[PDB]
Each structure stands twice: as structure tokens, then as C-alpha cells.
Amino acid sequence: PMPPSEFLDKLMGKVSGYDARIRPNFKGPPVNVTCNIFINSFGSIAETTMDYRVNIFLRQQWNDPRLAYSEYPDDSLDLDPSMLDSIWKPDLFFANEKGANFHEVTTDNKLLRISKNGNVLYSIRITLVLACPMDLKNFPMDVQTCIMQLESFGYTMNDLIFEWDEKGAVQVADGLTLPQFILKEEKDLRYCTKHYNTGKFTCIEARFHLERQMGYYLIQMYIPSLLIVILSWVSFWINMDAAPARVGLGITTVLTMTTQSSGSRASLPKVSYVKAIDIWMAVCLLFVFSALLEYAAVNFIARQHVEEMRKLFISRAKRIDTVSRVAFPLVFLIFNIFYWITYKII
Amino acid sequence: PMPPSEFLDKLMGKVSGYDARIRPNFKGPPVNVTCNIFINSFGSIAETTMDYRVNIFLRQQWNDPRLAYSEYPDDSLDLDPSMLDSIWKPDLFFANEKGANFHEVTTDNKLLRISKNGNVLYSIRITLVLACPMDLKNFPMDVQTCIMQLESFGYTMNDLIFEWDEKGAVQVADGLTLPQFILKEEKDLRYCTKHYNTGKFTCIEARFHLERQMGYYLIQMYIPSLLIVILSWVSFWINMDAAPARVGLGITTVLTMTTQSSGSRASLPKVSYVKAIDIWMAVCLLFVFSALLEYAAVNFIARQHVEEMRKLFISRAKRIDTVSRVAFPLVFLIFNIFYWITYKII
Amino acid sequence: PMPPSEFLDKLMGKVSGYDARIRPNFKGPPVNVTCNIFINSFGSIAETTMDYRVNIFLRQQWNDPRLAYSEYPDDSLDLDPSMLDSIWKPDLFFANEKGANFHEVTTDNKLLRISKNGNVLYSIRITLVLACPMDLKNFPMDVQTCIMQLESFGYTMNDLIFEWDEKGAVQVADGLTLPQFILKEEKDLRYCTKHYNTGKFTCIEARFHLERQMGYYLIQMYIPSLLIVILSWVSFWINMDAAPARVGLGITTVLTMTTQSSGSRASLPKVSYVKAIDIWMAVCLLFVFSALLEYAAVNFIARQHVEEMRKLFISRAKRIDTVSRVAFPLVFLIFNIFYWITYKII
Amino acid sequence: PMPPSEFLDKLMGKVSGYDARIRPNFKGPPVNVTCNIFINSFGSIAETTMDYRVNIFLRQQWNDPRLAYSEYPDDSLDLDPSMLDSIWKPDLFFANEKGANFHEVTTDNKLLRISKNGNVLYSIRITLVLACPMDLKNFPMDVQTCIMQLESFGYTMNDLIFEWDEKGAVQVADGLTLPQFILKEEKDLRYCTKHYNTGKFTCIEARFHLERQMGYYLIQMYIPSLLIVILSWVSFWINMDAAPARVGLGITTVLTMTTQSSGSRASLPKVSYVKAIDIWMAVCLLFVFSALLEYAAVNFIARQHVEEMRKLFISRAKRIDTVSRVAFPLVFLIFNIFYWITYKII
Amino acid sequence: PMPPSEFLDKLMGKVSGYDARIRPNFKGPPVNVTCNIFINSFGSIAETTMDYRVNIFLRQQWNDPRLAYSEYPDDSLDLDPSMLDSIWKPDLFFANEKGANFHEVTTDNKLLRISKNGNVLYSIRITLVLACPMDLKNFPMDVQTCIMQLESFGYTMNDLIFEWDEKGAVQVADGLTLPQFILKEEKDLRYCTKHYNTGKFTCIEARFHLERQMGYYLIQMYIPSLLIVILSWVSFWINMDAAPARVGLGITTVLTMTTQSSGSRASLPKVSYVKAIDIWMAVCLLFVFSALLEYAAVNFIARQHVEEMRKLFISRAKRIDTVSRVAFPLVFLIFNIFYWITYKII
């Protein structure tokens, strides 16, 4: 008969003595707020900034005995967010925020509904740009575990407790795709219970394994590196004599490997430790100098040589011939079987 | 006689028992909110970010029996947005927001007017920066269908229903032009009715086919690629002997194709799958190495050759002559008829 | 005697029945709001974004009979913007906003004063970043007409009318200078009266012819293009024989024209249609390949040639001599008289 | 005895008839607001945007007879900014704002204190990003005078007057250092009294001479330009004959001068008029083409030459020898004494 | 029995005469606010902008005798930030702000709790982007001391005093890692007590030594510089005669050192004084010109030389031989022992 907000106005109002400023079960057990998120959007992972943008549905669940209606014959009683500040709320935040906001588009995107026993369902939409450290040892082949963590600010452990729910504590959007990564489904859930001069505080937290898209930097960086190496070697399938063609076909290959290495570290954070993309290419550098080393190996022996003079020269021109046809691919094929296997097991 | 806002103040006020917190037809049928948009501005499609900026007029239409005036002799009774919060509103949002705002320029750009039976016309102006996935298989020749979707947050399906109206549910500005695309007029309208732990919620949604401007990357990337290919071949219309002109005219063409390929993938998202612009140019790469392959084919046979020695050499210098005048354009003209036809049918 | 705000408090207050929510002359003629702007700042025209930042003084003028004081012996009665929301205001906005704001620096920069008959002077300061389409056919020599337009949102035509005033409807700052353009003084003023499913709405609008600064891209792009063309031709004033100097002085000129063309389209929106800066330079490209075409024209005839063999060769070496000294400048001087005259009349 | 805010609450409250909406000395003399600023931070001068970020302490001083307490035995009575809106304030703004804000960090950074006679001390903290035109005729050697100006918005001249105070009207931070400039201590203070259709308004304004750091572009642009010029000339200290070393050492110098000129105008606004950095380098361009001009001067005379043929050739090879050893430095040393002296007197 | 906020409502309310506008111990001693921070996040040090982003927990501690409850049997009485504005707060700010904000994510991240004697614990979360000057004399090997400073705005020294606490006045996060630096644990704490026309104000301040990650620019800039120097010298281990290989292997090394120097100063602020990275590379420039100087030293003596003519030439070809094998590494090995030792002691 009576409208429920009118019933709610005398429920949580000054009548019935309800305060919005006091936690439920005060002078009693700590409040167990169980939670789960629905990731709407995810990504734009600025590895320069070492962070990621994510848009979630933060769902929060707890119970208030002060809000347990009895006579009203329904189960879930919703509330437009005008009266949302009139009730108690948790002091949730993120320990790795780096910028966030609500979404006031047409409405404060804020859900409330209350069970008969006062089980409080609370859902809001938050866009987060969460910082995460980026271990880039095997940089195109890393599985980044960028995390997120949810803590209480005023209420300590003894008055409030965050929880994950057991039934799928991270719901994921169906077409949630990543331009550069794959979100693995296994999402670790644990506690990061802090300690301060103030004291200790609750923390639930989530972990997100992100295996990359290997094929991109394969296309951009590996394959143009791959061409020059064979291009360095057909520059040994070049003519018998020390020609200016041997001069030109050598230096052309070297500058492109410098050029690809210039554009290699274009969007990278400036980590001290060596990553995987440069040792791919610095080896390709020291391979591409060997051809110019090989020409001077021809050129110094050509100047070393006139019967007996050139007799040693053309003999050494064959020891440089039949070995380099074998030694060039062998040092490169032994490189990849040395290279990829560590990056295949990690 | 009495001013209408004064009539409206006792209409929707505390007198006549009107609440802003309760949906119309409560404990009854779900509210059918029909809607249509007027796209003022559209574009700045950051394909790096895979999104698009759009400025709309979100028009919303429904009915409230609580707001049905009877005695007042007019039809549409407007309202400046001061009293807009005093009435019920829907909980509309976007499932792919990525940033939005209202427009408070001189006035909250918010329209209300009410029919005699309380049919509520509601219009606001929103700038959106809506995310959309970007399939870039045929990257200069794709028809991108970037979408947008409109959902309820608190009210489920059983209490609220979004609708498109039949009479032109997306109105488009007249001079709405795109710097890189064409908005096709056919705009698909359907439902994206979600399901959650909370439950199910209404969704109407719109789809926007965007065929590009083919001619730009034609000018920037195809035509400078086109010049080098013929420039590679007049470098076979070069002199009889293995000259340093054959050395210089070969390597000049190769580095520019590397240079255009460096500036090719300038503003591109890092997708794993191969797009169309690189297979345009990687083929142009492997074409441009064939000329340097052709010089060494001349150079190795020149070193292979003295009567019978040069007799085979000049004979092979003609088998490299009359075939390459035929084989060069034929492998390229067969490429484009292999290339464009798939990109002409999609 | 009594202070005027105290006189104003009983003027526009609840006493004397004044509403801020009702337009003047309600149930009567539409309100004629005449307006004019003072452009404080203007520019930073992001042609990539196809917009321009402008900071204006939006002056608005109309009349309210409800605000016509009688007994107070003065003419213009100002008001600090605290009481500005207490009166009626128009629902002005911009149809091409793309971001705007007010200016709360030390004070809401909001002017009100009221005549004896209630003629309302209303002035505020707005920074706008207004979108404008950019026709770039003659890109360094275009006169861009970037516009701005001012519409009503809730009030239709029959209740409200925007106007320009006759007496200089766009006031311009004195030292309002542009880094890349010239604002022509002639500013077209007309109507963009829209029509919707809602109905029709008033619009006044202004137009701004912007002729560029021609001399910049002259310096950056024309003059370095100009040097290579003569540098291509002194490479024909080179020695008699087909030298490696003819090889080196040719390819040096070609790569710089590629290099300038790489930096040519640095900050340009990706329009499909051809602009003027590339046809300046693509012609400079096909001129610079003619010198390498000319060397191979020497080189093929040098290999074509031994008495009668070289007799034709040196004769053709003179037909390539005396014609190219004439044919080189003539095709370029006929180009500019073909080029600039269309760009001098538009 | 009684707390002073309680004394202030009945001082400026509704009792004693104080209005915040009325200027002091109303229906009397115009209010003389004297002011001075303390520049906390200054710089990040985006010459592309032609503006500068500055963070100030805007101190404002005037007198209110309505706020002159009498009985309270102290001199300066401060006020936390909660009651700051309860009093009158000036309508100060900036005519060249381009974005600004207050600073609500832990507190509205807003100072009030009141003398016994009601002399009002008012100080706030503002970060400004102030636009300034950038005359770049002598671009590395200009003294930029970027200004700032402070005007009233509603109150005209006859009701309000801004002033500088005599005692150091611009206080400057001690370690206020600039990454690219030097703030000269002489700061011009004058009036920019505007005139409008509304009328005339007060303006005080400040001027800031900014002499650059000459040594940076000296290091980046002058010194690498300086090396090539001598590198062009040791390429004339090259061997007797027209060698391919003369070919290679010429073109190497030319492309670097193109390369430095490409990176020269990296961060520059696109002004039409010629600046100083390009005439530094375009002269360095036309110097570096003279060496390739000198080789062809050798090469054409080498092809011109066989007893009497080479006799003129080696004689002209000495007229090109002994003159160019003198003519090369002389045209460059006469250039700098032509160059720097205008840039030393301005 | 009675809830504590209800006890707090009559504690700090209008009853018991509590004002939020008056400092504690008014007309008495200055308030000693001791403080300490917990750095949550730190970094993204934009050396171009000369600043750093930091996210802190600003903890503030003082005492209010007005807030000393007596009868309530507990020690720390917390308060959700709704009633936070109802009490007195300090006027803290930062003198080097450059942008800051609070964090309203789900809750104003604002902590209050009050001891029995009214010792006020106050903690909030602030993200700061704090400016700091960047001395870049030894640019890859500098220890940057970027500071932060905390001042009062309205309250002077005689009414308010900031303090550090003795017990670890800067708490640091455990996994607080830097992408480019190391935060040294020693953090200097002192006073920056300002003086103005207003007067003098309290200041506590903190200092943060930041030693870089040396290994990055080692990898990016030192090692590619290191390769060319040996590559310059094997270009002297080249053949006996003045070959075009000596021409080509010289100029290839020079342009890469120009290319690395172009990408060297990519992200650097434009300081006038010379840094350490360029004197690393300008020496590498003047080393790499010596090889081309060495070829012309060969080439001029080759043209100087026919019995006695070449007899001096091959003798000078040995004085250029046996010295340069010794003189090349010696001038470079003496450089590094001159270089690094100053950068090892600072």
C-alpha cells in the first residue's frame, strides 16, 4: 500500500534511530564485506607508464541488522542513488589507484538493493588506471601479472573485513579482448593485509596473468632482422674478387640493422636490466659486422699478395670460401636453439 | 492564469504525493522508454586507442501517469533543468563509455517537456568517447562497424525496457563529415540484453558501418611504393656491363622501401594478425631485393668467365636479359590481380 | 537610501512573484535575445583535430518586463553572480562545442546589469575549442572559413529568438594575432535554424575567413625543394663522360626529395583528396628521377658503342647535351606558371 | 573573552546589515584595490603554444568601512575560507588566462585578514598558464617580454580601481630558476584600461623580460653546424686529382647539414617571418654546396683537357687551389662579423 | 550505551560551543602539528617537465582541548569524513604543487580519530606531481635530490607550527621501485620558514636522493658508441693501399655517430650548461673524424708521390702505420680514465 521509499524513509531515517555514520554490528564482530568485480573494459596498457586502464563493476555485499525490514512483503528493495549517502558504506579504495572516477552519465551509476534480513547489495561502476610493475626480462614473451588490491582506510581489521566470494569472484566480459595480450582465466586471490603506525587494515586483491601477442614484434622486429642475416650471406655468395659490390652489399645491411635497432626501443620504459628484444638484435648486429670483417679479411690478404705471392692468397681465399658457407648458418641456427628454448619454457 | 511552473510545483511536489525516486507504473508493467539520438559530431577515431569521439543528442521518451496534468489547456509543458531532478529519470548508461560528460555551457543542456497524458520527452547532450574493437585485416579497405550500447543499471528488465523508436531511431547531422571514413546510412538496431549475478537488464544498441577513405594511404603509401618498383626495373634497363651504376641504382631503391616501411606502421595498434598494408609493402620489399639479386647473378657469372669462358657468360647475360624484361612486370601485374580482388569483394 | 540589492531582493524575490524558471513575455511573443561577442583569444588551430581554440566575451541582451524597476533613480543596476541564478536566463549553447568551460578565476566571470525598463545586459567569458571542417585543396593557400553557431536547447523558435546586433556583432581584440593565419575582417552572419523531431530552434552564427601565412611552408618546404631542382641540373653541367660523379650527384638529390617529402606530411589530417603541397613535391620527385634517367640514357648509349660505334654515341651525347640545357628549366618554368595562377585567383 | 569569529559572525552577519553583494563605499568613490604577486613557480614555456605556466600568490588589498571593527583589541583578524564567501570580493580575472585553477590541497589556499579600520588583506594561490605572443626574429637571442594583465569584470572604472603597490609589486621566489631563460628583474607596471560596448574597466598589468639561455642551441645546433664547415674545407685539403674521395667527402657533409636542418625546426611555432636559426643554417647549406660546386669545377675542367689541353687544366687547377684556401674562411669569417653584431646589440 | 557519533554530535556541535573555524589553544601557544607521510607510489619523473608524480598518505597529528572527551570509555574514536568539515583543520599545502587532487574512490580517503585528551590523528591520501629542479651536470650519473615542502597558508608561525615526528617521519612502501632511479633511504628533514609582506610561515620539508639506473644509457648510448670506435680502428687494420674500402669504412662509422647523437638528446630538457652524455659522444665524434683525417693523410701523401717520389711516400705510410696502431687506443684509454673517475667520486 504505502510506497517503499516512504517505508524506507521511516526505516533508515531519524526515526528508528538509523545513522549513516556507524558501521553495522558496532561494538561487535568486524563487518565481512564480500565482493566481486565485473571487468567491463580492460587494457590500453601503457608500459611506458607501467599501468593499465580498466573499467569495472565493483559489487559489494554485506549485511546491516539496522536495515532489516520485516513487514514489507518483498525481497530486494532497490534505491536510486539520491538516498545512497543516507546509509552506511564501506571505506574501500585501491592501493595502486593512479587516477580513477565514477560515472555520472545520466545517473550516478550506483546500485543498491536490500534483502529482507538487510543483506546489502551494492554495485558501482569505476574506471581505474591501475599501476603495475612490469618485469620485462623476456619482453615479447613475458606473462605479465598486473594486480589490483582493495583496502579499507578508516576501519581497521577488527571492525571491517573484505572478502572475495567463492562463486566466481572476478566476472569477465565475454568479448573482452586485448590488442596486445591474453588475459588468462586463472586469477589469484589472496590478502595484502597492511600494517602501519595507524595499525593493520584489510585487503583482498586480484592478480591477472597477461601473456602477450607474440606475433606482432615477430612481424615488426624479428622478420626484418631475419632478412638482413640472409642478405648478409648472399653478400658472401657474391663474386670471386674483392669488388665494390662486396663493399656496397655489406654496408647496406649494417645500417638497416642500426635503423631497426633505432626503431626497436621506441616505446620502452628505461629499465636497467637487459630485455629480450635487444639481445635478439645486438646479436644480429654482431653478425652483420662479420661480413665487413670478412671483406677486410679478403682485402688484407689481397694486399698481402708475383707467383708465390698470390698462391697463398687464392688458397686463403678458399679457406675463407668453404668455411663461411658452412660457418654462417651454423652460428645462427645454433643461436635460435640457444635462444627460444628458455623463452619456450618460461 | 496561474503560471505553469507554479501549477507544476503543486503537480509534482510533496502535495499530490509525487516521488522522484519511484518509477512510473510501479508494481505493474515495465517502463518502455523509447529513444533516439541525433549525432551532432562524430569522429577523431583514435585507432591506436580503438575508440571514437561522438557528440549526441540523447532523446528519451516515456510516460508517467503521475505527471499527467488534466486541467491545463496546453500540450507540451517544458521545464528548465532546475526542476529536472525533482522528477523520476531512467538509469541509462553506456556499456562502452570510456569517458563522457554533460555540457553546462550557459545552461545544463537538458530538455524536458510533458504531454497532457504525461508522455515525457527528455533530451540531453552528451559527448562520448566510445570504445570499439577494430578488425584490421584489410586495413585501408575495411568497413569498421563501431557500435554503441545503452543499458539500465538499477532497474532490471521486469521494471524497465529500453526501445528504439521506429521513425528514424538515429538522426544524423547534415554536414556530418568524416576526415577518414564514410558513415553508411544503414544502422543496425538490436538488443544486447545482459545477464549477471544481479540479473538481466535491458539494452538497445546501434551499429555504425564506417568505410574508409581509400585514397589517402593510396597517396601516402601505395604510390611511393609504386615508384620504386619501376625504379627497380629501369635499373635493369641500365647498361650492358656490371657497372657501379648497377650497384648504386639498386641499393638506393632498397633503402627507400625500408624507409617507407618504417613510416608505414606509424600510427597503428599492435595487432598480432597481419594486416593489408604490410603485405602490400613486404612484397614490395622482396621485389626490391631481386634487383640486387640480379646484379649478383650478373656478378657471379662475370667472375665465372678467355674465349670459351666469356662465351657462356654473355649467353647467360642474354638469358638474364630477355627474361627479366618479361618476368619483372608479369610477377607484379599478377600480384595486383591477386591482391585487389579480395579487397574489392569484401 | 535603501541599498539596491536589498531593493533587488524584493524586486526579483518571492515577493513580486518573480520566477527564474519562466521566460519573459510568456504566453506572448518569442524573446528576442540579441548578442555579440568579443574575441579575447583565438587560435592554436589543430588542423589534425580540425578545430580552433577561442576565448570570447559572450554578451547577451534582452528585456524582462518582470525586472523593470520604476522608482530607483539609476539606469544600470549591476549584480554579482551570486544572484545570477535567481533570474531567468537563455538556454544558449554551441552546436560545434568540442569542449568548453567557464572561468571561475577569483570570481565567476559573469556580468549582469539591468536597465530601467528591464533591458538585461548579460556578459560571460567562455573558452571554446570549436570544431570546423578544413577544406585543404590548396593547403598552403587556402582561406579557411571556420564557423561558430549558437542555438537554443529547450526553447523553440516560437518562444525565443537569437539575434545579432547591427552595431558590430563581432568585436575583435586589437592585438589579436595569429601564428599561422590572418583573420579577415569580413564576418558573415546568418541563421542555421535547425529542425528536429522535437521541432525547430533558433540559430545565429558567425563565419571567420582565415587566410594563412604563406611564407612559412615557403621557407620550410618550397625553398629546400627549389634547391634540389637546380642541384639536379648542375649535375648535368657535370663533365663530358659518364662518371661516378654523375652517379653520386644524382642519387644525393633524389633521397633528399624523399626526405623532405617524408617530413612534408608531418602534421596533416588524412584527407583522401589530393592537396597542394604534395603535387608541389611529387612533381619535384619526378623531376629528380629524370637526372638518373638521364645518366642511364648516357650509360646505355655508352654501352651501345670502334670507329662508327662511338661516332653515333658522341652524336647522341650532343643531342642529350644541347636539349637538356634547354629542356630542364623550360619544363619547370612552365610548371610554376601552370601552378601558382590557380592559387593566385582563389 | 568572546571568540573573534563569534564576534565576526555578528560583525558581518545579517545583524549590522552587512551584505557580501555590495562593494564598499557604494554610491561614492571607486574602490582602490592595490595588489602584488609572489611568483612561486614559473616556466614550462611552450613556445609552440606561445604561453607559460606560472604559479602565483595573488595578494589583494583594499578597505571596507563596513568591516571596521572597533572594540576588539587586536589588529589583524584572520578567517578560514569557510566565511570567505560571506564578505564582498573583487571581480578580478586575467585577460590572457588560457586555463587556471585554485588549489584545494587540504584547504582552500585562501588568506583573509582584516585591520582595525577594515583594511582587507586577501591572498590566494593560483596556477596560471598565461598566453603571450612570441616575437622570434632573433630566435636564440631574443628577450621575450611575456606579460600578464588583471582586469575587473562587472565593476567598471567608476566603482573599482586596481592598483599596484609601490613597495615591490612583484615579489619573486629566491630559487626561481628557468630551464631556458633568465627573468630580468626589471618588471614594467602600467595600465591596459579597456573599452567596450559595456564600457571601460580597470587594468593593472605586469611585464616580464625573458632573455634566453644562448648556450643550449649553441651546443645543439651551432657547433654541429660549425664542424661541417671545416669538414667541407679539409675536403679541399684533399689530394691533387679529382678523386672519388672528393666525391665522398663532399656529399657526406651535405646530408648532415640537411639532417641538422631537419632536426633544427623540431619544436618551433610556424611563424611566417624568418627567424635567426635558419639563416644560420641556410647559409651553412649554401656553403656546403660550394664544395660539390668546387668538385664539378674541377671535373668540368678535367674533362675539358694532349700537351696544351692539360696545360690550361693544371693552371686552372692552381687558380682553384690558392684562391679557395683563402676564399673559404674569408667568406665565413666575414659572415659571423656580419651575423652576431646585430644579435649582440639587440 | 549512547552511540559515539551521537556523543560526538553533542561534543563538537553548537552545544559545548565548538567552532570549526578557530584553531585550538587560541590566544595562546602556536599549534604544533607533527606529521609524517607514507609514500604509496612514486615516480614517472618527467625530466622534461622537471617534476615527479608521488602518491602519499599525509598523516597529521595535533591536539585539541575542545575535542577532549572525558566520560567515554574508549581511546580512539574514528569519524567518517562527513563530519570532518565540522572540526578545525590545518591550512597545509605544498609550495611546489604543480597539480594535485584528493581521492574520492568509494569514499573520501580521509581518516580521523581522536584520543581521550583530544590528540587528533588525521590522515588523507594525496597524489602529487611535485616540481623539482634537475641539476644534470653528470646526467647519467647524477644523484637527484628532488624535494617537497609543506607550509601553512593563513596561520603564521605564532599561531601554528608544523613538525616532523622523530619516529620515522617518512614511511616508504616496501615494493616501492623506480624504473630509472634508486631512492636512497637517507631523507633530509629541515625547515624552509618563509617570509613575506604578509609575514612568516611554518615549513617542514623532505629531501629525496635519487641515484639513477646507470645501466640503461650504458646499453642505449655507451655501447653503440663503443662499437664504432673499434669499428673506426679496424678501418685502419684495412689494406695497404688507399682503397675505396678505406673511403667506405670511414664514412659509415661517422654517420652512425651522428645518428646516435641525433637520438641521444631525445628526451632532454634544454639546459644551457653541458651535461655528461654529449661530452661522451662529442669526443666519440672527434675520434670518428680522425679516420677520415687519416685517409686524407694517406691520400695527400699518395698524391705527393717515380723512384724517389714514392720512396718518401711509403716511408710516411709506415709512420702512419706503426703510430696509429699505438695512438688510437691510447688516446681513448686515457680518455676513460680521465672520464669516469670524476663520475665515480661524485
Ligand SMILES: *[C@@H]1O[C@H](CO)[C@@H](O[C@@H]2O[C@H](CO)[C@@H](O[C@@H]3O[C@H](CO)[C@@H](O)[C@H](O)[C@@H]3O)[C@H](O)[C@H]2NC(C)=O)[C@H](O)[C@H]1NC(C)=O
Ligand atoms: C565475519 O567473519 C569472521 C570470520 O569467521 C567472524 O569471526 C568469527 O566469529 C565466530 C562467531 O562470532 C567466532 O566463533 C567463536 O569462536 C570462539 C573462540 O574461537 C568459540 O569458542 C565459539 O564457540 C565460536 O565458535 C570465531 O572465532 C570468529 N573468528 C575470528 C577470526 O574472529 C565474524 O564474527 C564475522 N562477522 C560478521 C559481522 O559476520
Ligand SMILES: *[C@@H]1O[C@H](CO)[C@@H](O[C@@H]2O[C@H](CO)[C@@H](O[C@@H]3O[C@H](CO)[C@@H](O)[C@H](O)[C@@H]3O)[C@H](O)[C@H]2NC(C)=O)[C@H](O)[C@H]1NC(C)=O
Ligand atoms: C511495455 O511494452 C511491453 C511489450 O508490449 C508490455 O508488455 C505487454 O503488456 C500487455 C498488456 O499489458 C500484455 O498483453 C496481455 O498478455 C496476456 C498474456 O499474453 C493476454 O492474455 C492479455 O489478453 C493481454 O494481451 C503482453 O503480454 C505484455 N508482453 C510482455 C512481453 O510482457 C508492457 O505492458 C508495456 N509497459 C508499459 C508501461 O507501457
Ligand SMILES: *[C@@H]1O[C@H](CO)[C@@H](O[C@@H]2O[C@H](CO)[C@@H](O[C@@H]3O[C@H](CO)[C@@H](O)[C@H](O)[C@@H]3O)[C@H](O)[C@H]2NC(C)=O)[C@H](O)[C@H]1NC(C)=O
Ligand atoms: C521579437 O521580434 C519579432 C520580429 O519582429 C516580433 O514579432 C513581430 O511582432 C510584431 C508585433 O508584436 C508583429 O507585428 C504585427 O503583425 C500583424 C500581422 O503581420 C499586423 O497585422 C500588426 O499590425 C502588427 O504589425 C509581427 O508580425 C511579428 N513578426 C513575426 C515574424 O512574428 C516579436 O514580437 C518580438 N518579440 C519581443 C518579445 O520583442
Ligand SMILES: *[C@@H]1O[C@H](CO)[C@@H](O[C@@H]2O[C@H](CO)[C@@H](O[C@@H]3O[C@H](CO)[C@@H](O)[C@H](O)[C@@H]3O)[C@H](O)[C@H]2NC(C)=O)[C@H](O)[C@H]1NC(C)=O
Ligand atoms: C581611490 O583613489 C582615487 C585616486 O586618488 C580617489 O579619487 C580621488 O578622490 C579625491 C578625494 O575623494 C579627489 O580629491 C578632490 O578633488 C576635487 C576636484 O579635483 C578637489 O576640489 C577636492 O579638494 C579634492 O582634492 C580626487 O579628485 C579624486 N581623483 C579622481 C581621479 O577621481 C578615490 O577617492 C579613492 N577611493 C577610495 C575608496 O579610496
Ligand SMILES: *[C@@H]1O[C@H](CO)[C@@H](O[C@@H]2O[C@H](CO)[C@@H](O[C@@H]3O[C@H](CO)[C@@H](O)[C@H](O)[C@@H]3O)[C@H](O)[C@H]2NC(C)=O)[C@H](O)[C@H]1NC(C)=O
Ligand atoms: C609547541 O611547541 C613549542 C616549542 O616547544 C612550545 O613553545 C614553548 O612553550 C613552552 C611552554 O609553553 C615555553 O617554555 C617557557 O619558556 C619561558 C621562557 O623561555 C620560561 O621562563 C618558562 O619557564 C617555560 O619554560 C617555551 O619558551 C616555548 N618555546 C617557544 C620557542 O615558543 C609551544 O608551547 C607548543 N605549543 C603547543 C600548543 O603545544
